[PDB]
C-alpha cells in the first residue's frame, strides 16, 4: 500500500516532524498559550489530539461537540503547529460502557473487565464497531478541508491489553476465522492434531479459545487470530476516514520494541499509509543496543521507507517495577538513534506532565518542575538539531542496506511461547537481539528484518530462533545459500511448520540439506534441581546457556569449528557446537545453543572467516556504532553513537559535522562521550 | 479527642498492672476452667478477654441468646479475683446469620463472595449486618449491666485485618457518599483525582466505582481512606450502644500498629477510643527490638502520651508466617518490658492457653501444650511477678518521659506511596521513620514517634521521612517550626504532592523549598531489574544510597553540601549533592537525598548533628542499650534499660533502685545486660 507522509501546514517547508500528544481537554483552557509558547521555543511542530478524547466529543449518545478542539487547534494553526489528529475511538465514554456492558471485554474465567481500565473493549464487537465508526465519521466530516488537520492517528495502540478476548463475540469470531482459513473442519484437526487426551474436533462449532495444557496449533492460531481481529479493526476506521478525507495519510501507533509478542505489525503495516512506533527504553546495558535494534525493525517493517517515531520518553516512564531517568544525554541521543534508523518524525509522549492520574511520574518534553528544568532545555536543544538536520537535506533519505540482515518472525516467537516446549527458557525474541548486538561488538551495523522482507537479498541473513519453516521458507533460504549467499543458522530454527508440526526424519527439518546438520532431541539446561546441567562449555572459549542441540551427525563436507565441553556422562563431550558447511556457492554455519550476546561476539571471527565474511580486525569496531541513511544524490548521513561507558575517540567521517551532543570535532580524530552521538554529511 | 478512661480495678482490689490474655472456655470443656484459674492466679494474671469470637455461641439462632456458659466463668473469674475484658462479641457472625443473609458477605475485586469460615468474612458497610451487630451489642450490654467483674469493652476484634476491601454493592455506594460528604460537587472531586491520560472525567457521583487491580492514584488514595472512615464509623456504631447501655464500663478496640502496617489511620481512631489498646508481634531477626521499640513509641504517640494497653503479643512463635521463629530465652519477658517502659499500662497475650486444633494451633500461648512444666509458663510467671512489682514501685500512670526528637509516621503518606506508578516500588513511606528510630538509637537517642497530626513542633528536632504528602497547613506548621529554632531532618520522597496526590509543581521538595534549600526535578531509581542497571551510589561519607536517589539540580546560596554522590560520570550523579544543612532564620534544616538504611544514617549522624548544633553523645558505646524513661508528676522517674546488641554489654549504673532484671545484673558502680536482657531502675 502506498507510502504517504504527513505534509506541511500551508506556506511552510518540508521539516523532521517535532512535538508530542497533548491533551488540552485535560487542562483548564488558560493554559494553551504558555504551552504553544513554550512549544514552539522547543522548535515543536506538531501535536497529536484527541487520542483519549472521545467521552469530551461524544459527551452523550449521538451527540458530537466539537468547541474546544476547534478552539485550541486554531491557536495552535496560528502558530504554525500541526495536528495528528487522532480517531478519537481508543478510549469510550461511561454512557457508552454503561448502556452497552456487551462491548466490555472478558478474560479467561469470564470476568468482565471494568471501565477504566484501558482498552476495555472487545474488538470484534458489532456494537462498539458501530459506535466507533460513527465516531469516526463525525470526525473526518467536521475536521474536513481544515489546513491543521495533516495526519490521522487511528485509535491508540491496538491490543496494547484487549489483545486476548474471550467474550460470545470472540468466540465466534474465532471461529469464522477458523472457517475462512481453513474451510472445512478436516483441515483445521489436520494443522491443529489432538492433545494426546482429546479427540478431533467435529464442527466448527465445538471450536473455543484455548485458556490457561492448551494446543498448540489451536494457541498459534488464536494468537493470530487475535492480531487479525484487531487489524480488522483498524481497517474499518481507516476505510470510513479516507472516505471523507481521502488527501490526508493515516496511521496507528505500533509499540515494536525486541519483546512485544501480541500484534503481527509487519503485517499490519501493509494497512497504513506510513509506518509509527512508540518505543520505550529498555534500562541498563540494552539501552543502546535494544532501541537501536527495534528501531531497525521498524525500517525493517517499513521497507526502508521513511516512518514517524509518535513516542517515547523524555526521561523515565511509569510502568515498571523501577523505573530509572535516563542519564544526561541521552534525550537527544535516543531520539537521534531513531532518526538515524530512518525516522523522518520525533514525538513524544507527554508534552505536559501531569500533577494526577496514573501517568504522574510518567516524564514529559515541559516537567512539572517546568520551563526551568533540565529536561525542557534538552528538548529545546533536540529542536534546534532536528530543524539543523532538515536544512541539510535529510528528509525522505533511506537507511543504507546492510551486509546482514538478522530475520525477525512474530509467529515463531508466539510458537516458542508455549507452556509444553523442552524449556521456558528459549523463546524467539532473544536470538535476533543477541546477534544484532554482537554484530555491533564486530563493527558491523545489521538491518533486522522481518521474515517476510527481502532478507535473501543481502550478503549474509542470521536465522535467529526460527522456529517455524514452511517449505516455501525452506525454498528462500535454500535458493539464498545456493547462490552464494551466507547464512547464520541457530537452535530452534526449522522446528515445525507454519501449523507447528514438528518436523520429522530429523532436525533442522526441511533444510538438513543445506545445513549439514541432524539432530534428534535438545539438551536443555538449567538450575531447577541441584546437580542438573546448567550449561555447557565451548570449546572456542565460549559457554552456551538454556538449551543445546544434541548433534547426532553432520554431513561429510560440514566442518567442525568447536565442539561441546563436558561431564562424559551428559554425551555432550566433544559433540558440535558450532558447525560450516558449503552448499554450492554459500555458506551455512549453524550454532548449537545459546551463546548470547557475548558468546556471539567472541564466535563472530573465526565463523566469519570460515564463511568468507569479512570482518574488521579492529578490536575498537565496536566502541561505536554507525548508522547511515542516504539519499539519491549520492549525499550520506553518518550517525556515530558511543556504545560504551566510557569515552571514545574514533576515526573522523569524512564530511561535514551536522549535530553533536557529548561529542567532539577535530581534524584527525572524533571524541564522544558515553551516550553521545556525532551527525556528519559527505 | 475523646476523655480517657483506664479500666479500674474489681472492687476491694488495689491498682495493678493489668496481666492476662484472651480466654477461650468456650472452645473447651468446662472441667478444665478450675485449673486453667490456678495457673492464671500462680501466673499472676489479673485479666482475661472473653467471648471475643464468641457469637455464635450467644446468639445461638436468629434472636436468641444465652448467656450461661458465660456467666458461670465470670462467676469462677470474680471469685478469684480475675477481671474480665468483655468484648461486644460481633468480630465472627455464625453460620445461621452469614446463611439466612449472604448479603452481608464481602466480594472480592472480581465480585467472587468471601466463603465464611474465612474470618472478618462481612461488609463493613452493610446495613443488614450492622443491625444484627448492634442487637448482640446491645444484648451483651444489657445482660452484662452493673456486673462489676466486667471492667472493659474490648469492640469487636482487629477491625480490617481482612475485611478492609471489599467491593460489594454496599461499598460501591458507601464510597460514593463518602466522596459526597467530602467533596459536595462532582467538580470538587475531578479537581482532587485528576485525570489517568486515557479516561475523562466524571459527570455525577453516580459514575464512581472503587478502583479496583493501572488505577488512579487520587482515587485510590482516597478509596484507602473511605476503607479506614467505614469501619471506624462501624466501630463508633457498636461503641455507641454499648456505653448507651453501660456508660460506666470504658471502651476499647485492638489496633495492629507496627511499623509496616498500611491498612487503618489508626491516629485518626485514637480520637474514637478510651483507651488505646494495640497488638504487636515480633519482627524475627536483626529488627526484633528496634521495631517492637519503634512500634510501642508510635502507640504512645498515637495515645498522645497517656497510658495505653497491650492487649495482644506472643509468648514465642507465632503461625502466620511462612517460617514462624521461636522467642530467644528472655525476650518473653523483655518484649513485655519494651512496651511497659513505652507506656504500657497493660501486658497481655493471644493467646491464654494453647489449643490443640484449628489454624492457630501453632500459635504460642501463655499455657502451652507442653503444659505447666514448660519453659514459657514459667517465663509467664517471672513476668506476672515482675510486674505485680512495678505495680507496688508506683509506676502506673506514669508518663513516657519528652523525647528530644520526634519522627514523624504518616499512614496517608504510606497509601499514596503504594501506588503501583511511582519512581519505585522499593520504596514506601513506612520503612524510613523506623530506620530514623534504629539510627538514632544506635547514637544513644530514644526518639519518639509521632503521628503527622501530633504535636512533633514542639520538639527540638524532627525527623521528615518520606513524609510524600505535604499540604498547606502541615508546609506552615514545619516552616514555623523550623523558623522558631527547631532543628529538622528532612529526605528523598517527602513533599512530593498535597493531600490529593497531585504533584507539586516548580520543583521538589514542593512548598517547602525555601526551608530546606535544595530544588529536585525528578528522581533517580536504583536496582537490578535489568542488567547493568543502576544499583546504588556511593556516598562521599563512606555511606551508599539503594533504591531511589533524588537528584539535586540546584541549592541556596546559603545551603552547605555535607557530603556528595560518587557514581561513574555518565549517570549524572557524580559530586551531587547526597547531604545537606541549611540554616533557615534559627532552625534548622538538613537534607537527606536518598535512602541510607538504618547503618547508613546512623553513620551519617554525627556529621548532620554537629552541623544543625544538635548535640550527641559522643560515647561510642551509646548505641550498646536501649533507654525508655517514664516519668510521674512528684518527680518519680523508671528508666529501663534493653541490651540492643548480640553480646553482653556493661554500662553506668543509672542512679536509684533496682526493681526488675532479667538476663541482666545490677553491681555497685557498673550494670551488665546479657543479650536480651533487661533493667527498670526508680529514681
Ligand atoms: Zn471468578
Given at each position: 500500500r502506498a507510502h504517504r507522509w504527513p505534509q506541511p501546514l500551508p506556506g511552510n517547508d518540508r521539516k523532521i516532524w517535532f512535538g508530542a500528544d497533548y491533551n488540552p481537554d485535560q487542562w483548564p483552557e488558560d493554559v494553551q498559550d504558555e504551552d504553544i509558547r513554550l512549544m514552539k521555543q522547543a522548535g515543536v511542530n506538531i501535536v497529536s489530539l484527541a487520542i483519549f478524547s472521545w467521552a469530551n466529543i461524544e459527551t452523550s449518545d449521538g451527540n458530537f461537540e466539537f468547541d474546544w478542539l476547534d478552539r485550541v487547534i486554531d491557536k495552535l494553526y496560528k502558530a504554525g503547529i500541526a495536528v495528528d489528529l487522532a480517531s478519537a475511538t481508543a478510549s469510550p465514554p461511561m454512557w457508552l460502557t454503561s448502556a452497552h456492558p456487551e462491548v466490555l471485554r472478558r478474560d479467561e474465567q469470564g470476568h468482565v473487565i471494568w471501565p477504566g481500565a484501558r482498552q476495555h473493549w472487545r474488538p470484534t464487537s458489532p456494537t462498539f464497531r458501530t459506535y466507533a465508526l460513527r465516531l469516526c465519521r463525525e470526525m473526518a466530516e467536521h475536521y474536513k478541508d481544515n489546513p491543521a488537520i495533516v495526519s490521522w492517528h487511528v485509535g491508540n495502540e491496538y491490543g496494547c491489553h484487549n489483545y486476548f478476548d474471550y467474550s460470545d463475540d470472540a468466540v465466534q469470531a474465532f471461529r469464522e476465522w477458523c472457517r475462512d482459513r481453513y474451510g472445512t473442519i478436516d483441515k483445521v484437526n489436520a494443522a491443529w492434531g489432538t492433545n494426546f487426551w482429546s479427540q478431533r474436533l467435529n464442527s466448527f462449532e465445538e471450536i473455543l479459545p484455548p485458556r490457561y495444557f492448551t494446543n498448540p496449533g489451536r494457541l498459534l492460531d488464536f494468537k493470530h487470530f487475535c492480531s487479525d481481529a484487531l487489524k480488522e479493526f483498524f481497517c474499518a476506521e481507516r476505510d470510513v476516514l479516507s472516505e471523507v478525507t481521502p488527501n490526508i495519510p493515516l496511521t496507528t501507533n505500533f509499540m515494536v520494541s525486541?519483546?512485544?509478542?501480541?500484534?503481527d505489525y509487519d503485517d499490519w503495516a501493509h494497512e497504513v499509509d506510513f509506518v509509527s512506533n512508540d518505543h520505550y527504553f529498555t534500562p541498563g546495558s540494552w539501552h543502546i543496543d535494544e532501541l537501536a535494534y527495534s528501531a531497525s525493525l521498524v525500517d525493517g517493517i517499513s521497507r526502508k521507507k521513511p516512518w514517524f517515531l509518535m513516542a517515547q520518553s523524555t526521561s523515565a516512564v511509569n510502568w515498571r517495577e523501577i523505573n530509572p531517568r535516563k542519564e544526561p544525554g541521552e534525550l537527544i541521543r535516543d531520539s537521534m538513534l531513531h532518526l538515524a534508523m530512518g525516522a523522518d518524525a520525533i514525538c513524544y509522549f507527554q508534552w505536559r506532565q501531569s500533577r494526577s492520574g496514573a501517568e504522574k511520574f510518567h516524564s514529559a518534553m515541559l516537567p512539572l518542575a517546568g520551563e526551568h528544568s533540565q529536561i525542557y532545555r534538552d528538548v529545546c536543544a533536540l529542536g534546534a538539531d532536528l530543524d539543523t538536520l532538515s536544512d541539510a537535506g535529510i528528509l525522505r533519505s533511506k537507511l543504507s542496506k546492510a551486509r546482514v540482515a538478522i530475520v525477525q518472525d512474530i509467529q515463531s516467537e508466539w510458537a516458542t511461547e508455549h507452556t509444553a516446549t523442552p524449556t521456558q527458557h528459549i523463546r524467539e525474541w532473544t536470538e535476533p537481539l543477541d546477534w544484532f548486538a554482537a554484530f555491533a561488538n564486530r563493527g558491523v551495523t545489521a538491518d533486522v528484518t522481518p521474515i517476510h522482507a527481502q532478507w535473501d537479498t543481502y550478503d549474509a541473513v542470521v536465522i535467529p530462533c526460527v522456529y517455524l519453516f514452511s517449505e516455501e521458507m525452506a525454498e528462500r533460504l535454500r535458493t539464498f545459500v545456493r547462490n552464494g549467499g551466507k547464512a547464520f543458522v541457530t537452535y530452534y530454527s526449522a522446528l515445525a511448520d507454519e501449523h507447528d508440526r514438528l518436523h520429522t526424519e530429523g532436525w533442522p527439518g526441511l533444510i538438513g540439506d543445506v545445513v549439514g546438520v541432524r539432530i534428534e532431541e535438545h539438551c536443555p539446561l538449567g538450575t531447577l534441581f541441584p546437580g542438573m546441567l546448567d550449561h555447557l562449555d565451548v570449546s572456542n572459549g565460549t559457554v552456551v546457556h538454556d538449551l543445546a542441540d544434541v548433534i547426532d551427525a553432520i554431513a561429510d563436507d560440514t566442518t567442525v569449528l568447536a565442539t561441546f565441553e563436558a561431564d562424559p556422562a551428559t554425551g555432550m563431550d566433544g559433540r558440535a557446537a558450532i558447525t560450516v558447511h558449503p552448499y554450492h556457492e554459500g555458506g551455512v554455519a549453524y550454532i548449537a545453543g545459546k551463546l548470547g550476546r557475548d558468546g556471539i561476539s567472541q564466535s563472530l571471527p573465526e565463523i566469519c572467516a570460515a564463511l568468507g565474511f569479512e570482518l574488521?580486525?579492529?578490536?575498537?569496531?565496536?566502541?561505536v556504532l554507525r548508522v547511515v541513511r542516504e539519499q539519491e544524490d549520492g549525499a550520506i548521513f553518518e550517525f556515530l553513537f558511543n556504545r560504551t561507558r566510557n569515552t571514545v575517540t574514533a576515526d573522523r567521517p569524512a564530511g561535514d559535522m551536522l549535530i553533536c551532543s557529548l561529542a567532539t570535532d577535530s581534524t584527525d580524530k572524533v571524541t564522544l562521550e558515553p551516550n553521545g552521538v556525532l551527525a556528519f554529511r559527505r
Open positions: 525486541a519483546s512485544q509478542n501480541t500484534l574488521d580486525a579492529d578490536p575498537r569496531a565496536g566502541d
